[PDB]
Amino acid sequence: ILPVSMTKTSVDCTMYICGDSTECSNLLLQYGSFCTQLNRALTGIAVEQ
C-alpha cells in the first residue's frame, strides 16, 4: 500500500483569520504578501497532488 494523493485543501486568510471584519481585512493587507503566498503555497500543493 502506498499513499499517492493528499486532500487538496486551500485556506483563505481574509476569511480564515477573520470573516466580515473589514478593519481586520485592511489590517491584514498591512501585513502584506503573507496570504497571497500561502494560497500560492497550497495551490502549489494542490497542483502537485
Q: Does 15 bind other proteins (CB under 8 A)?
A: yes
Chain Cα centroid distance, residue 11: 3
Q: Does 19 bind other proteins (CB under 8 A)?
A: yes
* Sequential DSSP letters for 3-26: ----------HHHHT-SS-HHHHH
Identified binder of other proteins from the candidate list 21, 37, 43, 49, rule CB under 8 A: 43
Please state, in angstroms and rounded to a whole number, the distance separating the CA atoms of residues 26 and 48. Answer: 31
Q: Does 23 bind other proteins (CB under 8 A)?
A: no
- Binding positions for other proteins, rule: CB under 8 A: 10, 12, 14-15, 19-20, 39, 43
